[PDB]
Amino acid sequence: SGFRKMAFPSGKVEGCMVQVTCGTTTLNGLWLDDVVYCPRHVICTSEDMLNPNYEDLLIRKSNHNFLVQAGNVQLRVIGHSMQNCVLKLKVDTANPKTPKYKFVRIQPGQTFSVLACYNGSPSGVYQCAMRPNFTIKGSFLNGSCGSVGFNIDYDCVSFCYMHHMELPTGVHAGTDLEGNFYGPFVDRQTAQAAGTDTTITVNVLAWLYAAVINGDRWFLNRFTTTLNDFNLVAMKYNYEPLTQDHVDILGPLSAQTGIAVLDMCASLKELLQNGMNGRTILGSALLEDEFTPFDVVRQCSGVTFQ
Amino acid sequence: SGFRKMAFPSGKVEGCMVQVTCGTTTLNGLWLDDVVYCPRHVICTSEDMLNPNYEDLLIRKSNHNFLVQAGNVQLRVIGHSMQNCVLKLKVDTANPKTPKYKFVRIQPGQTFSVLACYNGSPSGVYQCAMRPNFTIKGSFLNGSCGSVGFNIDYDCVSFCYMHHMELPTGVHAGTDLEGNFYGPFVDRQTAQAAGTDTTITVNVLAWLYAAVINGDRWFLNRFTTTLNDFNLVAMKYNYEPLTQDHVDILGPLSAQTGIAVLDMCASLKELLQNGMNGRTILGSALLEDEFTPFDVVRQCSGVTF
Numbered sequence: 001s002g003f004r005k006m007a008f009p010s011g012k013v014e015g016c017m018v019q020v021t022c023g024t025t026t027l028n029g030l031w032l033d034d035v036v037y038c039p040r041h042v043i044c045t046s047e048d049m050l051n052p053n054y055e056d057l058l059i060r061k062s063n064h065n066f067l068v069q070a071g072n073v074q075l076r077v078i079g080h081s082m083q084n085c086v087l088k089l090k091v092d093t094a095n096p097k098t099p100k101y102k103f104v105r106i107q108p109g110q111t112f113s114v115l116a117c118y119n120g121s122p123s124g125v126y127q128c129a130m131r132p133n134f135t136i137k138g139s140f141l142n143g144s145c146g147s148v149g150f151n152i153d154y155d156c157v158s159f160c161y162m163h164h165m166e167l168p169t170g171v172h173a174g175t176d177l178e179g180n181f182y183g184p185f186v187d188r189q190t191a192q193a194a195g196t197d198t199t200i201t202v203n204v205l206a207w208l209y210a211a212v213i214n215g216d217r218w219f220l221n222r223f224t225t226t227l228n229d230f231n232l233v234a235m236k237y238n239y240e241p242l243t244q245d246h247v248d249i250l251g252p253l254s255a256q257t258g259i260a261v262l263d264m265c266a267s268l269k270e271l272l273q274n275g276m277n278g279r280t281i282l283g284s285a286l287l288e289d290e291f292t293p294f295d296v297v298r299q300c301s302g303v304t305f306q
Numbered sequence: 307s308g309f310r311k312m313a314f315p316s317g318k319v320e321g322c323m324v325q326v327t328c329g330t331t332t333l334n335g336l337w338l339d340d341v342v343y344c345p346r347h348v349i350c351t352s353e354d355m356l357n358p359n360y361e362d363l364l365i366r367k368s369n370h371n372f373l374v375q376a377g378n379v380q381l382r383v384i385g386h387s388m389q390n391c392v393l394k395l396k397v398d399t400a401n402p403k404t405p406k407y408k409f410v411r412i413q414p415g416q417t418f419s420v421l422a423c424y425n426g427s428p429s430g431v432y433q434c435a436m437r438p439n440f441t442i443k444g445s446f447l448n449g450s451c452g453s454v455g456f457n458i459d460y461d462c463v464s465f466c467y468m469h470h471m472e473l474p475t476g477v478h479a480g481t482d483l484e485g486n487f488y489g490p491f492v493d494r495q496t497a498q499a500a501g502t503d504t505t506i507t508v509n510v511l512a513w514l515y516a517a518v519i520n521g522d523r524w525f526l527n528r529f530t531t532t533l534n535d536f537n538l539v540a541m542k543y544n545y546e547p548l549t550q551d552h553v554d555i556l557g558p559l560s561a562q563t564g565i566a567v568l569d570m571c572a573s574l575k576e577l578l579q580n581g582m583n584g585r586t587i588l589g590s591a592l593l594e595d596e597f598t599p600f601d602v603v604r605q606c607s608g609v610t611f
């Protein structure tokens with residue numbers, strides 16, 4: 001029993017974190033085999049950020065301008081290249097702690113663990129979701145750039161995020177491990193703002209199923225809804241539209257509890273209209289949207305507390 | 307910017323988790339040097355749990371009755387002993403991944419990271435606090451016994467909890483690594499219940515300071531209070547009494563924000579008597595009490611391990 005915001009064990013990722021320094025700029029790198037991946041803005045000063053010409057800044061650099069430190073050992077850079085917004089530093093030593101891994105680009109609504117790092121040293125691990133506006137609500141200070149997001153389903157680490165910046169509203173933006181930004185952001189200090197964010201409806205529904213599995217049903221009702229009527233109401237509360245794909249993905253949770261997806265949608269409609277009236281759901285007074293259907297199945301018991 | 311419920315990196319603990327099997331019971335063990343530590347109830351069947359005589363159950367066991375598996379390697383048990391509610395299995399191989407460590411017993415209000423494990427394999431990591439009633443609000447299924455709680459300071463892992471059982475309300479109970487239970491619990495199948503819990507006041511105050519550090523200031527006011535007048539409010543709302551020690555511990559957070567502790571107490575008093583009026587603090591509609599003053603300082607400074 002219980003339901004917590006749970007991160008993947010971070011050990012496999014901790015063994016990949018290194019410090020990358022270019023001149024006066026220091027940040028984190030990810031060392032997999034003989035390559036260290038890091039944000040390309042490691043080659044920029046604060047003034048370079050207004051309108052950086054990364055190609056012009058990079059051509060002036062040699063391999064020995066990049067200092068890479070793994071623990072208390074200096075790695076030797078023997079090559080460098082830029083791929084989108086990521087710098088790939090070829091080193092002369094393969095990481096002996098390289099886990100089984102993949103680079104995966106995730107969609108909004110998907111969750112992942114973040115290993116926050118400073119100076120190549122891990123400080124903490126927490127769970128995040130890619131928001132519908134492509135930002136993440138992380139906890140990152142200056143020096144955290146290059147910290148990564150990942151999932152570890154079945155002993156293989158799937159790297160999905162690398163940290164690059166904090167937006168004026170205090171939320172965060174970054175790239176996949178190929179250097180492609182999530183959202184319409186650029187690694188430039190120009191006017192950029194997080195678009196209006198919305199609630200991840202399929203995740204709220206998954207978390208309501210989690211509350212039912214753990215033995216709570218106070219929020220259910222005798223009503224049902226059509227998908228379009230549900231969407232017409234939900235969008236009035238800044239909730240993402242629920243698609244037929246989301247209904248399909250909720251199938252196993254619907255089967256385990258015996259509650260049809262559109263019946264749970266009717267409960268969600270009522271909760272949006274009424275609030276919780278002094279009650280909580282899984283120890284929360286707000287509707288939680290950073291647990292996916294897959295996360296609930298992973299954490300919750302396969303047996304419902306009927 | 308940002309404020310999240312953050313756990314310590316779990317790598318140093320993952321390298322210590324093993325599977326321990328005794329007959330039909332399978333749970334997790336902690337392998338440090340040549341000893342594997344695990345709940346002593348690994349030697350019990352469901353019927354034994356009704357009224358177990360652990361010394362009598364243990365004397366009937368040989369070293370070869372304990373199957374210890376580290377990854378896909380079988381460890382050989384060469385000795386066994388019991389210390390309080392923990393079983394210590396001497397093995398023929400020292401763990402090459404043993405970190406620098408200490409066994410520490412924590413007080414209620416203190417937080418720690420839990421590395422939830424099943425069959426000796428880590429599944430997840432989350433943060434939690436020892437409640438004033440000595441239970442923890444964890445997330446554990448059958449097979450999670452032997453999973454541990456810990457904190458890190460520099461390179462040293464301080465092991466503070468080992469998981470043993472779930473109570474009827476869905477909360478959890480366990481021991482320190484010397485096998486002493488937190489709370490008035492026993493490792494037996496009998497009627498046991500979590501006592502009435504209270505809110506960790508010093509932690510709520512620390513989290514209000516974290517909200518001010520992050521730009522949330524709507525709840526601040528021109529008022530102050532005495533510690534005596536605040537404690538009368540705390541008792542009325544099921545909050546733990548705030549002591550001069552708690553005020554001293556909040557000193558660095560008070561200095562960073564320029565808000566006196568008793569000044570923050572007057573803000574909490576008004577929140578307790580009026581609610582949030584449709585507002586949130588750090589994305590929460592409830593007053594959060596599972597961040598200590600040290601957790602707030604550590605997260606807002608970037609301490610590494």
Ligand SMILES: O=C(CN1Cc2ccc(Cl)cc2[C@@]2(CCN(c3cncc4ccccc34)C2=O)C1)NCC1CC1
Nearest residue numbers: 041049140141142164165166167168186187188189307
């Ligand atoms: O003070 C700056 C200037 N930043 C320009 C800029 C522009 C583009 C890119 Cl890709 C990167 C950056 C920087 C590189 C470091 N960085 C940070 C990343 N993660 C957490 C942070 C926490 C505090 C300060 C900085 C952080 C950036 O956003 C610095 N940004 C933050 C202001 C609130 C808005």
Ligand SMILES: O=C(CN1Cc2ccc(Cl)cc2[C@@]2(CCN(c3cncc4ccccc34)C2=O)C1)NCC1CC1
Nearest residue numbers: 001347355446447448470471472473474492493494495
């Ligand atoms: O059905 C039982 C019988 N338990 C007796 C008992 C008595 C004393 C001790 Cl130390 C241990 C135990 C057991 C050993 C495993 N265990 C569990 C630990 N953590 C999460 C669990 C989740 C589900 C089931 C069991 C769990 C215990 O509490 C099993 N407990 C669950 C009922 C709510 C209360």
Ligand SMILES: [Cl-]
Nearest residue numbers: 105106107110
């Ligand atoms: Cl995805």
